[PDB]
Amino acid sequence: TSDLIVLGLPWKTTEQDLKEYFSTFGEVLMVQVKKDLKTGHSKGFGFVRFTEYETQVKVMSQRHMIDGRWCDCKLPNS
DNA sequence: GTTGAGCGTT
């Protein structure tokens, strides 16, 4: 019921990858990877919204090895 | 063709 920000994302990681990964925990409403609009190069972080809340809690309780690097899913500021 | 803590153009 709330967006989770994802930190530590590898540079090459794309939206659908993040989606693909996070889907293994449950249904994913949306996903975002923040990039420079001019180059498309990832800024290293993203966002994700889950349908179920229990799926959201689970994802925060642990770190995430995404494309070779440990990533953190935290509640965002503002 | 580069980097590595952070906080979201629509």
Residue numbers in the entry: 103 to 180
Give verbatim lines from the article.
One example is TDP-43, which binds RNA and DNA and functions in mRNA splicing, translation regulation and transport. However, when misfolded, TDP-43 aggregates and forms the major component in the ubiquitylated inclusions in the neuronal cells of patients with amyotrophic lateral sclerosis (ALS) and frontotemporal lobar degeneration (FTLD). TDP-43 consists of an N-terminal domain (NTD) and two tandem RNA recognition motifs, RRM1 and RRM2, followed by a C-terminal glycine-rich region (G). It forms homodimers and the two RNA-recognition motifs are involved in nucleic acid binding.
After refinement of the RRM1 domain structure, the difference Fourier map (Fo-Fc) revealed a clear continuous electron density that could be fitted respectively with 8 and 9 nucleotides in the two RRM1/DNA complexes per asymmetric unit. For clarity, only a single RRM1/DNA (chain A) and RRM1-D169G/DNA (chain A) were used for structural presentation and comparison hereafter. Superposition of the RRM1/DNA complexes determined in this and previous studies reveal that the unmodified DNA bound in RRM1 and RRM1-D169G (this study) fit well, but deviate from the Se-labeled DNA around the Se-labeled sites at A5 and G6. The overall structure of RRM1-D169G mutant is similar to that of wild-type RRM1, nevertheless, a small local difference was observed in the β turn (Turn6) containing the D169G mutation. Superposition of the two proteins yielded an average root-mean-square deviation (RMSD) of 0.39 Å for 71 Cα atoms.
